[PDB]
Amino acid sequence: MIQEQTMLNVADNSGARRVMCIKVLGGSHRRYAGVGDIIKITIKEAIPRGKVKKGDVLKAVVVRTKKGVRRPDGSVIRFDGNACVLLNNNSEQPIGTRIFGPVTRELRSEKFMKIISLAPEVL
Amino acid sequence: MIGLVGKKVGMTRIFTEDGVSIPVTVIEVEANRVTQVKDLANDGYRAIQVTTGAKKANRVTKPEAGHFAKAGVEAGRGLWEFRLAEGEEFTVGQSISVELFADVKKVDVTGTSKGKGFAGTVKRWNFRTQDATHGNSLSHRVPGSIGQNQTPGKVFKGKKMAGQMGNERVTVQSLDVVRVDAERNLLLVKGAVPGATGSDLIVKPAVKA
Amino acid sequence: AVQQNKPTRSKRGMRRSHDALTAVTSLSVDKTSGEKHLRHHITADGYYRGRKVIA
Amino acid sequence: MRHRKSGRQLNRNSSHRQAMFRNMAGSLVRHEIIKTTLPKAKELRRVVEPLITLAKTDSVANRRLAFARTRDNEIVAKLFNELGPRFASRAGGYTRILKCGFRAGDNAPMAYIELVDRS
Amino acid sequence: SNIIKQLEQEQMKQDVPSFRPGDTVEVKVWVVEGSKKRLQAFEGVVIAIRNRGLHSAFTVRKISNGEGVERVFQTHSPVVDSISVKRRGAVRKAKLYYLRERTGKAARIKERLN
RNA sequence: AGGACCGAACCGACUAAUGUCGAAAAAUUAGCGGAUGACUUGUGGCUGGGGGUGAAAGGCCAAUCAAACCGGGAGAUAGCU
RNA sequence: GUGAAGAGGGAAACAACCCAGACCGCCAGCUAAGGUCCCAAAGUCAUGGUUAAGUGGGAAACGAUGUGGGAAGGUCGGCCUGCGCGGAAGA
RNA sequence: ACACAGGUGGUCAGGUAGAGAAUACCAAGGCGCUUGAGAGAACUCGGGUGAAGGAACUAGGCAAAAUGGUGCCGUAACUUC
RNA sequence: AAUUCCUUGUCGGGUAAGUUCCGACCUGCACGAAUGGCGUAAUGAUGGCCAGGCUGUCUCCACCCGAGACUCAGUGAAAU
RNA sequence: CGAUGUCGGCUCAUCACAUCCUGGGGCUGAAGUAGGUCCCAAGGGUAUGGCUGUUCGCCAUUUAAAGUGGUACGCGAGCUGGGUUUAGAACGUCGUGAGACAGUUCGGUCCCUAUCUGCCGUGGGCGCUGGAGAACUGAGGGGGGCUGCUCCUAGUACGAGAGGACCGGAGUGGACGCAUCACUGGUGUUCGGGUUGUCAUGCCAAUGGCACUGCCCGGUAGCUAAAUGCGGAAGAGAUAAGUGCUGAAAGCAUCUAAGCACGAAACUUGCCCCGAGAUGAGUUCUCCCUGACCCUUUAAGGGUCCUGAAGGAACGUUGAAGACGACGACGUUGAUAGGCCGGGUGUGUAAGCGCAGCGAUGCGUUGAGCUAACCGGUACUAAUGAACCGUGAGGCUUAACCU
C-alpha cells in the first residue's frame, strides 16, 4: 500500500537513498500500489558518485511493503520498511546492478526476472 | 432449472492440495418437500411450491395444517415457490434432495441482508464526509446540498438520503459451487451470501451463464 | 424555520388524532384473592398466581 | 448497531454502573428481597447470581474474589455461610423477578427481586 | 452448529507440535513453480499465536539481511510442510509486538529449562 | 541588582470549538500573555456634556456616545410613507 | 383607439388585441368577433380542387424537385405559378 | 429581571508524594449541583483508539498530535559581549 | 519594496511542478534621510516562506465511551 | 431597496448535446499502424498535485478521456469566510486639508428548535363486499449497464524497408456498486495482566476506589475495511447514421414509391430490487362460522337469550429486527431470555503453602487463576387464561348449467 507522497527506501545500487512516490500508475484514480507495481517517484536523497542525481523523476517498482502481500493460502508477508527498485524512465529496466535485502515471489515475471535473480533472498 | 431453500450455517474455508484457501459458505439444504404444483390450466403459469425444515403441531395453524395435509407432507418453516422451466415436471409430495446441484458450477443465492437500522448518508450511500476542522460547524457528516435554487424548486425522487439500510432481499450472482453433499445435507458455496447465521437462503442455478 | 400561515383546527385535530390513549384490557383476577391485577404483575395485596409473595 | 451485544448501560458510565451494581448486590444479599426498576433487576440478576455460584464452592481464593466483587465483610460472610450451602442443590437461577407496578415519581416499571428460598 | 465444527475437524492436521510465543521456530514450506516443488525454510521468532481450531495461525519474525521480515502462517495449511522448534523463549507475554522496535541485541530472548 | 526568566494566586484576553429564542444582552472548555512592576486591588474623594478623561481607539463617561440621561420649548419640522 | 377609470364574449391561460359599453330581474328569442368530432354549445353540411409533409401546429439564404394549373417552342427541352421537401441543435 | 455555569475585598488553611498555596488522593467540613425511567437509530456535542501513508486537506499544519522533569556532558552563525 | 500598473518583470536557489519566499538587476508608473534613510544583537499570543518529528487534516473513514436526539410519566415557551 | 445578502472552495447533484473516451458508419492527399473530416449516438465514465482567494490560467505525472454548456454565472434556513465590501493601522500617488484611490499591505461576530410543498425511510385508519392464515402472477417504478493491459490467432494480411492488422477467443488489472467476517487487520471504557501516586478494607499478604479507561500491554463476540467473494454481460425484438436485394413510375438506371435482409454502449426485453391503494383494489391453496323469539315504513332494520369459532390482538421472555411503531422466535405440549454445567477464546503461571535468598525476587504446586456478547446441553428462575377483539353460511339482475 504505497500512495502519492510516500517516502520509500531504495533496494538497489543506483545511488538513490530516499525517494517519494509522486504518482501511482496503472489506471485512473488509482490510489494504492502493492508489490510489483510501477510508480512514478522523485529522488530526495542520493550519494555523490551515483548513476542518478537528486531531484530526478523516474519510475520504480515496490518490492517491500509494511502492508505486505497475500499468498493464496491466506498468509501474509509483512516487511519492516517500504523499499523499491528504481527503473529506467521508458525501458522499465533497473538502473542499479545489485539488489539489497529480500524481495517477494510476486516479481516472477518477464519484466522483473533480472531483479528477482539479482536479489539475495526470495521469500 | 429450479432452486432450493437452505439455512445459512456460517462460513469457513477449504484448503486444496495446491495450497489455495477457498473461503466457503456452509448452507444446510434439507430435502425440500413439494406442497403444490401450479400449471397454466389453473394458474396461468407453471411453478412448484416447496417447504423445508420442521415445525410443531402447537406452532402450526389450522389453514397451514390443512394445506400441508392436502399436500401430504410434514410442516416446514415456510413456503417458497420456484418457477418451472419447460419440460421439467414435479409431483405433489415429492422430496427434492440436494442432488440437483451435483452438476451445476455456479449458483445465485438470495436472502435478507443484515439489518443496519437507520443509517446515515455516509454509511448508506458512501458519501464523502466534510471537513472535521477548518472552522466546520455542526456539519461533519451531514449530506450537504440536496438540490438547486428556485428553478427546480423541489427535491427529485430517488435522492440519496439517510434512511433504513439493509434488512432487505439481496441476490448474489454467479457463485462457484465448491462441494455438494447429500448425506449431510450440505452445500459449500465459494464466497459470501447475504444474511446472518441461521437465515433462510434461496439457492438457484446461475441465470447469467 | 417558522410557519407562513397558521395551521387550522382541522390539521390540529388530525395530528392529535394519531396521538390518543388506549385502554388496558388484560385485567386478570387472582384465583385466591379475587382482585383485579395486570397480567404478569403482583396484586395490590402482594399475591401472584395465587401465592402471597409480598408482605 | 447493538448486534448480539449484552448488558444495559442504564445511562451511566462504567464506573457508576459497576458501583451501583455492587451496592445493589450487597443490599440484595443483606435483605434477601428488594424493589427496583425492572431493567435494574434484570441486570442485578446477572451481577449477583455468579456471587452465589462462587459461594457454593468454598475456598480462601473464592472468598477473596467475592470480597473483591462486593467490598463488604458482612455480606461475604453471609454469602458464604447462609446462602452458600443453601443453594447447593440448585443449578443456578437463585432469584425471582416480580413486576410490582409503576413508580409514582417518574412512572417507572418497578419490580420486587427476591431470593427463591425466602420462605 | 456442529456442521462447521465437523468440517474443521476433518480438514485439520494432527501433526502440529506445541510451541509457545517467544520460541524460535523454523517452518519448512512448499514453493511451487510449474511442476518443480522445493522446500524453503523460514526460521524466526514466534511473536504471535492465534488459536481458532482450523483457522489457527502464528506470526513469526525473522531479521533478514537488511530488513526485518514478519510472516504469518495458517497452522493447518498445506503450503507449510513442517514445524520445528529450535529454542524455547522465556517471555511471559502472549503477543511479542515490542520486538519490532527492540531492533537490537535487546531483542534477544532468554532461554527456559524444563 | 534587574520596567530579568519559567510558572501558581491575581490581572488580561491571542486561537479553536460550543453557545447565537444561550447557563451568560459577551460566557464555558481546552490551550494563551504579564506575573517586583509603566503591576494589581479594597475604601473614600475630584474632574459634568461641546464638557470631562483618554500610553489616542473618536475609545470611556451607569448594558446607550462623531456628543450621556431626564425634564421642558414641543403637537419642532417633514414638498416624505 | 383601448386600459388607466369597463365588467361581458373570443385569441387555451393573456389591463392595453378583436367584438361589444353591465339600471335590476326572467329556466325567452335574434346576432357581432370567433366557431360547429370529443373535452365543450353548435355542420363528421353540400359543391369544385390541393397537400402526403402530421405541412397544418416556429423561420431565412440556398438546394433539389414531389406533385397541381396556365401560356409558348422541335413525343421532347424551357416560362410563370398553388401546396409541399431539406436547411431546422438545449438544457 | 431568574433558586442564573458570571462578578465580589480580607483572615485561617492539616496528611502523602511533590520545588510549590500547581497537581493527584485524603482529614476536618460540606455536598451529589430540584425533573426522572428506559432505549443504545441517523445526526450533533465532549472524549478514547486505529492498519499503510504522513500535510497529499486547507487560504493557512486551523484543529489535533507531538515535546515536556532532575543531575552530568556538549551546544552554531551573529552580537550592543 | 508594507511602496511596481505593466508584472506571475528577468536571472539564480528552493520544489517533480512555487502568482507566495530568498539573493540579485534597475527599466524606481509613483523610495529617500528627524512626516527620518540604511543596517541592527535581543524581544514579539506580529506578517511571509522552508525543513525535521508528529499525527484522522486528508487519502477513506472504522469502532468504542459519555451528553442530547428517540420512547414513557410530570411541568410546559418562542419567533411567525 | 417595510432586504432576492456574497466571488471562490467543500459536500451533493440534475439536465441538454453543439460528443472528450468508449460504440456504429461515410469520404480520404485512408498500404497497414496511426490519423484528418463528417454523420448517428447521452448508457456510463469523464485525474492527483505545485502556485495564487481565485473561477481562469501556467507547470509536473498517469490512463479512455481529464468534454462544452444550463440549473439565482445550481447549491451558504447544508459548511468555510481566503478575496471583495464596515469600524483600526501603514506605504505610494492625489489634495493645503478633512479624506480619496486604472492601488498595495496586517487584523477583523456568518442567526433560525421545519408549519406547508418536496425528498429519504417507517407506521396507524379504512377500502378491496362473510371473516382469516399463506404462496404468487406482474400493470407500473427504481439500480449496474465504465473500461485498461497482456497473450493466442500472428510476426499473419498489408508493406521498398521499418513496422504491423480486421474479425474472434482467453487471462489479468484500475474505478464503482452489492454482500459477508472464513483469512489479514482496526475497535472492542462489559475480558485478563503490568505499573505510578494516594486512600481505605485493623495490620502483612491480597484487593477495592480515584487520578482521561490514571497510564499502558494484549484482546472474545459484534461492527467494520485496507480484507474477502460477486456484478457490469451474453442473447432477442424494433431501429439511428449507414450497407444492400429485387424493382417499376421513367422500355435504361435507381436502397423505395410495393416487398424483403443486415445494422450501434442508443429504445423495449433479458439481470437485481420494490410492487394488487393496479379504487382496473388480480390469481391459487387451506381453515372457520349450518340457533329460537318479537315488532314496525314488505328494511341489505333493530332488539332479546344462547353462541361468539378459524384467527388476531393485548401481556410476558426476547432477537445478528429496531428511533417509536413495525418485523421475526418463544410462552410449560418450552430452550425465548437470564442463570448453571461442559467447551472454546483471551490474558497469561491466581491466591495460599513450601524451598532458595537474612535482605529486592526467583523456584515447585501450574499453561495455574479468571474469563463479556461465542458453541453444545440443562426448566433452576421468569414466560399464569379461550380473559379481550373477531360471530350464527355472506345483497339484486342476467347468463349457462338440475328442479
Ligand SMILES: [Mg+2]
Ligand atoms: Mg415450537
Ligand SMILES: [Mg+2]
Ligand atoms: Mg527579494
Ligand SMILES: [Mg+2]
Ligand atoms: Mg413527554
Ligand SMILES: [Mg+2]
Ligand atoms: Mg417581506
Ligand SMILES: [Mg+2]
Ligand atoms: Mg475575509
